[PDB]
Write a protein that binds this DNA or RNA. Structure first.
Lengths: 100, 84, 109, 99, 100, 87, 98, 55, 54
DNA sequence: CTAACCCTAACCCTAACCCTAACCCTAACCCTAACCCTAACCCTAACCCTAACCCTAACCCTAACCCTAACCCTAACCCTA
DNA sequence: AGGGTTAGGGTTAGGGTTAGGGTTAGGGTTAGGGTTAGGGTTAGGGTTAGGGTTAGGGTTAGGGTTAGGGTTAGGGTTAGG
């Protein structure tokens, strides 16, 4: 009755390594295209975006999210913690100067 | 056709979890997905507003990768590869 | 043979040197050719910004029981105006302090 | 000085007139005037550089009111950009009406 | 409120309220004038620092130190603390991207 | 005469009172003890980047005096923007 | 109607030549070439802007070798700036001699 | 026939387009006058950076 | 909210003054109880800018 | 801008008291980690089409480019608010 | 700023032209909300020590008031870039 289930932590660490040793993308392309189209609809109607444009947008957004998650994890480690919290992201955006 | 809530939910939870794992996060709280989606939506809104302003200045209707790179560099985020 | 010489500032209705702005745009190595409506537009934008900043500074000085505008009042008005603080975020005003902001945790029991 | 010396350039009379127009019976300091001059020069250089970049990107060789308006909309924030654009359009209309 | 001893933590809140309403320099001029020149000795000897350069350098250093102290204080209250520490300045400078 | 040169004691020239009021302006209610050295270490690196840029700006004009306009141009290029002290 | 499509200035031939000079056995991906082109263009624009800013600060109307050397010393860090300055001095000396 | 076009790159010993750099400095609205040794210096700096990155 | 106001007022017990202060401070609570007057309670010391001395 | 005293007068700096606050267990929560399997899903594959892009082709207008002449901007000087 | 001339960059225009959109469709992919449980989190207590408080006596900085020596831009000029 025991399939040697992975204990909270084992998978987390090896998944982090597997996702760090790769160069592929994570967020899908069509939902991001639908999102940026809906956002562009709030400015000028009848707009036609480019494929390389939304690709660069997804790449920059994924890099910014990775940096924000790194800063949040560093703040959590400094707070003698291992999990992230919304207050950590708030303090990170306040120190980085994105709040204004 | 076209729902507003379908777009914020487009940034799925496993995608944000994989991004946090790639950054180096072992445990991701539950209230992180909404804040991440909101910050990403605000950043995308700003970048798309800049790109729309650039396209209107070029008197055009197609947003190009060059205009996106220019808008990203105007804020201090220089990107290589996609463009020249 | 020049009849009269009406000043460009009077014909524009602004209070900024359009002639000097045009000379700066021409000698600043920004471009070879310079449009004629561009110095007037820049002068109008600069005049509006100056008027807004001076109005905020005068309001702060009148609230501080003074008459002359000091850099302290200027910094107070800039930090109070959200749009002005977002525009001039990386600008530090000399001879000026911050706002007396005390956190709730630092307050005594 | 004036020992066959040079003449520097500033924007003092203009700021004084603007202050007198927006608020009468008030004063200003020399440090405040210098800060206003530095702010005006910084915004001027920033808008000029943005307009030059926008004109060079479109393969054009003329910085016009459209390029200046785009630079203002890109540099200035929210409602301040709209108010500045409205005042600039009014000034351009007055210039086209009378010169 | 005996003149013999005051509650610790109350006199500082009075000091903070008084020091936050003045624009006078806190670092003294003669000691700061010798630091600027000592540093400039390694780059090039024989220099005539202007009477207005040291003032600008001091005004910039004071503002930078005040901003760093405010960031360290903001980082201090995050860990359920109220005091700053040398381990908080490192994180405050790393999040800003100066030492990274 | 003046048979003495400037030594390296200026790094400790900043007094404890000096950094004990610089922090209370920002809101620090309790200044740590080991912070007195970290602040002098941080201030030392900050005053070296602007001085090098000012020296390189002055050496371009074959001059030997450092004006405030060079310090302002170095601070604008580093990332700051000081208004007032200079043109 | 006619052909004569626009030509796009790129530094691919020079980057490949530098690669063959350094490592004459390795290759470069299409993305890598574009990244090198963007890096070269960005550094060139930064150095040109710094030289123009220096020429506008000091009353002058030309850009000599001293302006480019000062821009390099201001932009590049420590050892990289010194090596670039030494290479530029050697190049201008070879040009003035040959 | 302007005799022959001796390549400036073969005169500079570098592997970067000194002529294109000079043209970029002249048409880039950076200054009204562009020096002769400045394009060579910029080409040498760019070549050193490219060589280091490629190595 | 009442306990927070009492702790800010250096008092251990909750008084109708603290209750009225918390109700007037909370926007949603003030919108919900707009036509309710708390007995033995004063308003907030709100002084206009024109009433301030010049 | 630097070099050289001056003379008080704020600055600094050791030097005990006195809290008080910050770190170490500690227990009690508690919350996210970890399958999982099934129902969206989207990224593919070609293919039209279509509307915005794009490449010539004059040409015409508007900015440059010089004088010269008003004309405003900028240095000086005391004094009063 | 006005007064007068010119040439080069906009500018329109239409015929090509091209890339983006839109299309189904379908099938491995992927999400993702279940449930479950294990490790992490946080106030609570506790205690002691680390800076707040005090404070005054030596230390030393702020004008102040000069000369005197560095040092640099002002004028002119010319030939080379």
């Amino acid at each position: 009755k025991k399939p040697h289930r992975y204990r909270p932590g084992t998978v987390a660490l090896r998944e982090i390594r597997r996702y760090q040793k790769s160069t592929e993308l994570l967020i899908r392309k069509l939902p991001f295209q639908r999102l940026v189209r809906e956002i562009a609809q709030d400015f000028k109607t009848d707009l036609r975006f480019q494929s390389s444009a939304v690709m660069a947008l997804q790449e920059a957004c994924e890099a910014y999210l990775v940096g924000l998650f790194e800063d949040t994890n560093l703040c959590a480690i400094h707070a003698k913690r291992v999990t992230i919290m919304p207050k950590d992201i708030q303090l990170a955006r306040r120190i980085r100067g994105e709040r204004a | 056709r076209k729902v507003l809530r379908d777009n914020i939910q487009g940034i799925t939870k496993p995608a944000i979890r994989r991004l946090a794992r790639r950054g180096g996060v072992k445990r991701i709280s539950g209230l992180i997905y909404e804040e991440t989606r909101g910050v990403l939506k605000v950043f995308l809104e700003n970048v798309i507003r800049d790109a729309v302003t650039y396209t209107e200045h070029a008197k055009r209707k197609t947003v190009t990768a060059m205009d996106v790179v220019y808008a990203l560099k105007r804020q201090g985020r220089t990107l290589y590869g996609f463009g020249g | 043979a020049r009849a009269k010489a009406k000043t460009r500032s009077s014909r524009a209705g602004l209070q900024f040197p359009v002639g000097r702005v045009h000379r700066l745009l021409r000698k600043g190595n920004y471009s070879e050719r310079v449009g004629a409506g561009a110095p007037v537009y820049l002068a109008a934008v600069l005049e509006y910004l100056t008027a807004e900043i001076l109005e905020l500074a005068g309001n702060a000085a009148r609230d501080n029981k003074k008459t002359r505008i000091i850099p302290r009042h200027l910094q107070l008005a800039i930090r109070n105006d959200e749009e002005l603080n977002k525009l001039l975020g990386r600008v530090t005003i000399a001879q000026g302090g911050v706002l007396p902001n005390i956190q709730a945790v630092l307050l005594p029991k | 000085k004036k020992r066959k010396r040079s003449r520097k350039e500033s924007y003092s009379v203009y700021v004084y007139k603007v202050l007198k127009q927006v608020h009468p019976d008030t004063g200003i300091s020399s440090k405040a005037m210098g800060i206003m001059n530095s702010f005006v020069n910084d915004i001027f250089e920033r808008i000029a550089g943005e307009a030059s970049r926008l004109a060079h990107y479109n393969k054009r060789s003329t910085i016009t009111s459209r390029e200046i308006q785009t630079a203002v909309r890109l540099l200035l924030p929210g409602e301040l950009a709209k108010h500045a654009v409205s005042e600039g359009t009014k000034a351009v209309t007055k210039y086209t009406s009378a010169k």
